[PDB]
Design brief:
monomer; alpha/beta; D-Maltodextrin-Binding Protein, domain 2; 2 domains; eight-stranded mixed β-sheet; seven-stranded mixed β-sheet; binds magnesium ion
């Protein structure tokens, strides 16, 4: 089945915006509240769903001649650019469009809105006589040196079930020998999940000792409430994604969709992300440590972000996508 956690926010004043988003609802709530305070006559129908489902649903609904979401917001950058390339989005010519960083804008249609790293997470109580691995080489070595302790107690994204796939496809482009890492994880009996939150809950209470390619923003959110979750930005390289927002062609209320997009692009909206949600901002109007500018300044070539402006060519086609997934299953089982 196709799943969604739906949350409906009535107009503050006493028109409903429909959002399909992969941003976990509790972290989304401050953005929703900010939008609603700015727009007291707008109800918000927020559907929290997997990135692959955002894609599938928009394609299915649009193809069916039906209406679809007014705003699609997804960490599966490739699937968002594909929708936009195949005619499932519509152009949004807005206030901040021309000044939006060029890398973060495909044809005033798909906009990259955040700057979020894929990180290691660890159970702090489990790393008391040795510090956790900080590179992929160290990760593999740790797994080997602690074969029995780690076995079935590490986790990563099930790339078959979209941000996981993105991160793997980027790992393959940096790291020639990513497959040694995948193989090592399979020998350690790696468990795979569709969400960072599932992995974070299990690392938090020590069921798992390590997670790989976890969303750093979510990890920082967890760690702020659960002191036993530690985070390592990998020192060999750190893949960075950006959540992409667009207004579907078949939006019932494209105007409300564009309003929400404008809010997400605004100084106010981007400051809520940076300052409240531990999601680093892309807006050239926002200063501070939780920004793409400062992160690039501090970390440099360690960071491996993904550009939007070249379009679909940056990303793997459907058949190569399928091939990479069967290779990944092949490595985890070898
Ligand atoms: Mg999510």
């Amino acid at each position: 089945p196709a799943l969604a956690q739906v949350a409906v926010f009535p107009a503050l004043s006493g028109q409903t915006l429909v959002v399909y988003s992969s941003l976990d609802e509790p972290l989304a709530t401050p953005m929703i509240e900010g939008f609603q305070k700015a727009n007291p006559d707008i109800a918000v129908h927020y559907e929290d769903m997997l990135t692959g489902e955002i894609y599938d649903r928009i394609v299915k609904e649009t193809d069916a001649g039906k209406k679809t979401a007014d705003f699609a917001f997804s960490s599966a950058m490739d699937l968002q650019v594909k929708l936009s390339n195949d005619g499932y989005a519509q152009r949004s010519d807005l206030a901040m469009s021309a000044r939006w960083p060029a890398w973060a804008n495909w044809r005033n249609t798909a906009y990259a809105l955040t700057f979020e790293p894929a990180v290691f997470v660890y159970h702090k109580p489990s790393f008391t006589t040795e510090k956790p691995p900080a590179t992929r080489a160290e990760f593999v070595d740790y797994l080997e040196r602690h074969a029995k302790e780690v076995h079935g107690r590490i986790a990563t994204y099930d790339i078959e079930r979209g941000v996981g796939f993105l991160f793997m496809s980027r790992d393959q482009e940096q790291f020639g020998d990513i497959w040694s890492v995948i193989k090592a994880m399979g020998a350690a009996g790696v468990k795979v999940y569709s969400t960072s939150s599932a992995i974070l809950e299990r690392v938090s209470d020590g069921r798992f000792v390590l997670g790989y390619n976890i969303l750093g923003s979510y990890a920082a959110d967890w760690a702020s409430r659960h002191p036993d979750v530690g985070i390592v930005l990998p020192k060999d390289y750190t893949v960075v994604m950006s959540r992409i927002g667009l207004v579907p062609e078949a939006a019932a209320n494209p105007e409300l969709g564009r309003r929400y997009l404008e809010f997400f692009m605004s100084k106010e909206g981007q400051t809520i992300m940076a300052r409240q949600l531990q999601i680093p901002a892309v807006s050239p109007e926002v200063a501070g440590e939780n920004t793409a500018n400062t992160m690039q300044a501090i970390h440099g070539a360690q960071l491996r972000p993904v550009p939007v402006s070249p379009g679909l060519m940056v990303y793997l086609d459907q058949v190569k996508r399928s091939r990479l997934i069967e290779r990944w299953n092949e490595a985890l089982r070898s």
